[model samples]
Target: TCPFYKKIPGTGFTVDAFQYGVVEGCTAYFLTHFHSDHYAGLSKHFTFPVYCSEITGNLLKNKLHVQEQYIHPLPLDTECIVNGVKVVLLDANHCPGAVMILFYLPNGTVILHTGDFRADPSMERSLLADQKVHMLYLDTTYCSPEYTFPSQQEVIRFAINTAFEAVTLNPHALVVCGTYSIGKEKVFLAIADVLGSKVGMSQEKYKTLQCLNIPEINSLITTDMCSSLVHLLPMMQINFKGLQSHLKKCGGKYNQILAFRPTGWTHSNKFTRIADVIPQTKGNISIYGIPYSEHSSYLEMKRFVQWLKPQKIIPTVNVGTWKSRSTMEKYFREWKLEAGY
Candidate 1:
């Protein structure tokens, strides 16, 4: 029932196939990253041997409480034999523990599976640059020309500056930054560090963040509500009503609330700057939808395709419809044609 199943071809390894559970012929499962969508159907009861990078393996075992015997952590940038196939892990540059998987089948075919990544210059310099990829299983999260959000640095700077101005003018304003369970830590962490504000989150999230093993994260995150005005919240909890409820929970410690909903979906070509994309406001709360994305932009994807020059391209996301797949295919053909393929 998995349309993308054909991408792996002869390799018995299924990349990010937890949503479909066990495939008929699959002997091994390779998890590309630790995101919920990637590991959607995985559970503690899953009996398959799942392979991933060291950090991803740790998260699966600790966060999901998966059995240790079933979890296999592989080293990055090293070739390893899995099910008689050579596999290599490269940094995806998307989030902590996220990776782009490469497979070398016994029949002399090379496959690259990018599990949600941000294309960067370093990726072009990796070992993939020198090899000929026969087939490419791409992330394709933002493969359309319409998704041209600013760089991650620009978004983080905008968030830090916007929050800085609001808090500087009103020292009693409570800053709440939206984040996911695994990604978008950089946005909130930068804002907190720049403003010298303490950060707080739910105990469950605190435990998950601790598993990252980032030394700075340990000192910045706290459990006490009164210890920090800058709080990290899930993406869905950054709305006005949510902020109002959170403010009430804070026991009237702060007078105003400045919240940031960071995501690529907030981008628009017309509103490139904060002045044009004004923060929405209602009474004591202001919600700024910052364009902080962890995925590659449309142009970035084009550049990546041109560089890789794979003979075949298959999208991993947004491929439910023929129209969407063709829409991406148009760009793939155009990029390859432009690259003199």
Candidate 2:
């Protein structure tokens, strides 16, 4: 499925496939965002022209060190021509620079490629709703019927409230949040803001955030670890070992560790309420795994596909093997039957 994203079918554009080498017939390379998975194969030696949002463009030069001249960042909602094909970038609502690509080919076929998106009601008002989509390259990360994660607002509220309560019990507790290089920033930021504290991060993470140019964030991020109660670390470091290492690294400035691990993995039947999503505590560390995701849920994808009703659905994820591909396609048929053509 990674190779499948290298070159869009029936188009001369390649997307999130820089690692696959020079894709034949690909006139332009479009990156949906600055995420490592999406921008994986891109390098300083990359030859093709890279197209992305302005924020992603800044990240390319600042983080990845891709040449500036080769990077062509597009403005959102504006139609731009690349090799004579009309293309538009729409806010994907997943990460800061993430976008949903709309390609209008010379043959009059409309292709909507959602690199990765968290679906919302406001997206229903896009201009594509008025047109007939020929194909939809969907983000099928959670394309089953089971992943009904709570809304980001609800999850963020839960995270902030939980952290606030934990800190109330122990004023010197260190609030640590698990995060990707770019996603899930809101979770930790909300917690820090409510607690009237700044967010602590490594210098590299701070530099990457600077590329995002978020107004409030410039004042919110700090390299001084002991000053901020909430520290943002790589998602992999939310475990007990990492927590212990973090406490030692901070020189015992904080007594206890309250770590928030956010992901979209929780089953729908498991938690009856958003608040019901609880934490596991042992010794001086508590880890709360929240159902926070940047990808569309099963219901959200269904609603999006039904709204567009593209003549064809091409899944962009979980398609690496026959079983996984067929499993996803089964849901497509079920969704079609439910949507009634």
Candidate 3:
């Protein structure tokens, strides 16, 4: 059950939104990332003492225009006491400034919210050594068996290898990669670094990436079809019709326009038609979809669950059993995967 305001029975902490002022007094408001879904009603016009990582705090100031007094930037892996509750922050490998929250209550209760992350070796070692989970709020976006895929590093290599192979075959081709408004910067940034070329992005993306303060991030140039080699476009701007038409006139100069759509859905059994490569187009723009995700694979989730040994798992997607322990237990026991963990 997903509710706007979530609190452990006796714990004083509340994570994420449950609408403004829904609860009488929330000790603090914790936001995992800046993704609109997790940060929907949290806007520039809001009022509350918000807690997030430093990078996310910067975004809150830059994007949401929130004031410093109302924002609290928490350090990852550091434990802090708020209203007499113990809180530890851990890195969530989803996007910049994303973090998973660990709360230790006075009555011997331990709760962890994964926020959004690509569960990997680092996270395993960080939290599994001595800590335990009494309850786990899991990110179940692609929790099914068929959702297996390569790690983000491997996927970046795939794009690098494939993009190089395509460009080598057609020297005049331009490669463009589609990303979200905020996620998947690593793959795209890696693609640019390995290629020894600059990436092109819209001004908005440039501003956001600037806030991240990454090294190679400075190499991203403005998006331009005429001269740019690699373009970082959001999924919204990835329609091939205009690209196909643009490259047609240039074929007229350039040999091709190759596009890659990186998505973890490639390994999912049920996926939309929008995620694959089209056969042919005017610009020789072959749109190839690649599997890349920040969310942990099913295998990763299995490992996490095994290590945490949580009493119950609350599915964050497609289920609404908010505040009901019985339903959460049922949901965990009835999951498609029962033995892997």
Candidate 4:
């Protein structure tokens, strides 16, 4: 009768029915974010009812191209019941659609799972001002001492200055940088705030920015006319052949073209081909690498976890399976805190 029971003897839990060939009880599932590692198995392995934020649901439906019925969307800061379990989603501020999940059980137990978060001032203010957190499942991607990053404002200033320098150095050259679609919006806003001009964007990107509704920054244009200003365009639409063809037909002349890619390419020759090789047609094209990351840096991660003062801080995603369990225990011991279930 226990056909699907691939049991964890001491833990008293069973693996998936398909994997073990024995039926097991299913618990409610909480999806923290739309990142591949977090959301990939939802449609397949997790058949139990799932809960996530509205943004995450839309992202799953649109960006990840998933079926609509699979996700049950809840507004941020609102509690909902999924298979009789209480769950809430909070803004994570790592990406546009990112969220952190909070679970409260009838037995008076609570758990907070931070998907991936940065210690940006805005994000910290939101997290700290909210209700007190219980057991914390932290994102320890950069938990070590190696990733002490500057503040978000400082990073934005540096990126602006770097791009400005590139422009001054080669007015007629095209400059390209790499960034993610959502994260790149911040780069664009930074550039707009500093440069006080519009950055070129495709129709899709323009729509995304509008939905985000950033109050302070709102001046973007898309046209073939070059205004001796900095502009951000998609890398796919801007290539040697495409640029040549457009320039020939549209008569658009620019001192330089800057292209930024957020993801989907390696940092080796593949990146070089796009950043260095392609834009060599009209003038000198230089690619500048700025380490603007969305994930929490090491110091931020430690600071957030320390301030939360959780009884146990479990790290789920980044660490190695065996390494995480022991590392989590060690961290709790170092902080003079007892581990929670």
Candidate 5:
């Protein structure tokens, strides 16, 4: 069964393996990021100009290998009229290209959709200017108030400190972080800033970072550019067996490697095997649990709801089941408000 949209089965709606199709006359569609859950239905049935940010467009093209014609990129905070509805994109500091969408309709209604945003200061600054949000479609994935997340700055600082500790103990070691192409860049920048050194990248990572117009990364030194203090290794290179061997032979002497992997890496049992095949080092390997998530934690969500003070809040995305909906309703009742799914 479909989660978000409301329609009759096999009539106006039909579920495929991973997507649902709308019959027709769908006025608008907005995608907050390039995540599969948000855009899985776009290429299959709903082709009516998916709205998102330019960064998101780049991600869709580069990561998803989507066609140019499929995206309608909008600059942040610029209002665009789509099918008589006005939409605006705002910076969502969850990931490099994530966004929050605001929808203004002709019939005097406003909707703010927070698509997997974290409670970063940058995100708060971006939203400070938007003062007229009416209906908030929130990301209540962590709404119970028990969950908490560290700030992006704190996460960065931890990674940098960990990298320093790892490298100081074993100067010859290489640091490898497992992050997606976009999110990893931020972590790399943090490491570079803290170490005051630049790292080298493989041709592939170079191309990807270049395509994103990632600013001249702080402390990024090419292989030829390394002076004396520290050397940076492309995270991807750490994954490749042949390339790693080639580096060892090329006299690229680094012993300690600091890497970041998603929490799922352990559950999937991929990290152990991947670590086994890589070049062995005398220095110990450490996996730092930075918990760099893109979604807001329970406390962040509660704070956002209180700050925005919306007349009515609608929790979407992760809260879809009937029991879940009832739970949400009970939670909202404490504030003397009704909940809608």
Candidate 6:
């Protein structure tokens, strides 16, 4: 269920979409990014006028089969009127083509939807203008005070360094860099660049990267699998059941595989609980979790909320297991007031 946040009497502006981007009175639908959990029911079949950044539109048309007619590209850091509302797109920094939406309704109320974003200094600077955000639809993926990891560059360095160490220790062992479809492209790209080897992946992954058009990634992709020192496999393929056949002793032709799962939930930098980076090993396959995340940690999330200080906060995610939705709403509301307005 999407937060239908606001509908100005005449303008009909809306924040539409927790998943399936279907809305009733929306003049135009704004997509914060192209994540599976965010774009649940949407497909190329979507005929409504959906708005996103250019790269996102390109992916929709080229990869997702979404018709170009329905895609409206919004340039970054510029104001564009959509159905009588002034809208500006800001960098989400979650993944390529990800953006946080800022809508200035005709009623003089400004709203922000931070769709799965990591707060950067530049982004924080951009929001420092006198325009107070009336409401905020936040991406609280890691809202708990338990995730504190380095930036994308640091995580990339760690993965690359770890990959080299793993392969150096076991000459016959191949490195399997587990990554999501879009978020961790840079991690594998860095792996290929540092090792001076081509990367291998499924055709879909390759196509998505092609849309991104990274010079390094372009030079790193290979149709042949074993020709590369490190393999960029989808996170799912690195599973025990999935990697079993690959790591098996196929008459000694098979090289052992060591997998690294890059996500923010790892125990490296915990905020409350004590955790450790434990690598799961079964037979010849080893899977280790890395702390690389696109979403903001609780620390980052709290800082942004404290500053922007939106009048009301609505969570982008709907949680069933916890009282975070109400707890978050109440906490932020009270937290803002206790700071003496």
lDDT of all predictions? 0.84, 0.85, 0.70, 0.54, 0.57, 0.72
For candidate 5, give the lDDT of residue 54. 80
Whole-structure CA lDDT of model 5: 0.57
Q: Quickly count the clashes in candidate 1.
A: 0
Per-residue alpha-carbon lDDT of candidate 6 for residues 1-341, written as tens digits (9 for 90 to 100): 44344333345544435253555666676676777766666776787787899877878788778887898999998979886678889888888888988878777878788878897656667844648888787887877666677777766776778767776787777777876757767777777777677887667777887876455555779766767766777677779987776556234655677787776676546542213355798877888777777888777887778777777777765455467677666667666876655
lDDT of 4 by residue, 280-327 (tens): 234433343444567777556656666666765656544556775676
Candidate 1 residue lDDT tens string, 1-341: 65564348887768887877478888888888888877888889999889998889889888999899999999898889988888999999887899988888889999999888999877887889777999888889888877877788777778888888888999999999887768888877888887886688888888888777677776788887688878988778888888899899888789999888876665465457544677789999998777777899888888888888899988888888989988988988788777898
Residue by residue across 241-289, what tens digits does model 2's lDDT show? Answer: 9899989988867889999887766664355788776678889998988
For model 1, the run of ten residues with the poorest summed lDDT:
266-275
Query: Which stretches of candidate 3 lie above 4 Å from their native place?
Result: 1-5, 18-22, 220-227, 245-255, 267-283, 320-341
TM-score of each model, paired residue for residue:
0.95, 0.95, 0.84, 0.67, 0.72, 0.87
Q: What is the lDDT of candidate 4?
A: 0.54
Cα shift from native, residue 195, model 3 (Å): 2.4
* Best by the TM-score measure: 1
Is candidate 1 or 3 superior in TM-score? Answer: 1
Candidate 2, residue 159: lDDT: 84
Error of 4 at 107 (Å): 0.4
**Candidate 3 collision pairs:** 1-321, 1-322, 4-17, 4-18, 5-18, 250-253
Model 3 lDDT per residue over 96-179, tens place: 888888888899978888888777777767854576687788887666666666666666776787778777787777777777
Candidate 6 error regions (>4 Å): 1-10, 14-22, 127-130, 248-254, 266-278, 319-322
Candidate 2 stretches with Cα past 4 Å from truth are 1-5, 268-272
Error of 3 at 315 (Å): 2.5
